[PDB]
Amino acid sequence: GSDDGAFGDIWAYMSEALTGAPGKIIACGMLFSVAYFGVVKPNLGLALVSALMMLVMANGEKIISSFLA
């Protein structure tokens, strides 16, 4: 596909925000949820799953660009 056009700026902002401030805010919310739900039932596997989801988010732009040429 083409990264430019009328919607090039919107796509660019979304791609940078995936690993930018909004993505970091979502990751921090994930860490907060993992810590909070571990008060009654301590489960560190959710931390591993959250780290995997951050890894997926960091590669979201590459995945989208590879699927949508």
Ligand X SMILES: CCCCCCCCCCCCCCCC(=O)OC[C@H](COP(=O)(O)OC[C@@H](O)CO)OC(=O)CCCCCCCCCCCCCCC
Q: Which residues bind ligand X (CB under 6 A)?
A: 7, 10, 14, 17, 22, 25-26, 29, 32-33, 36-37, 39-40, 42-52, 55-56, 63
Q: Which is nearer to ligand X, 4 or 48 (CB)?
A: 48
Phi-psi region of 5 (alpha: psi -120 to 50; beta: other; left: phi over 0): left
Strands (E) in the chain, as ranges, are: none
- DSSP assignments along 16-35, one per residue: HHHSSHHHHHHHHHHHHHHH
**Could you give the string, one character per residue 19-38, with x where binding to its own copies holds by CB under 8 A and - elsewhere?**
xxxxxxxxxxxxxxxxxxxx
Chain positions contacting its own copies, by CB under 8 A? 1-11, 13-40, 42, 44-69
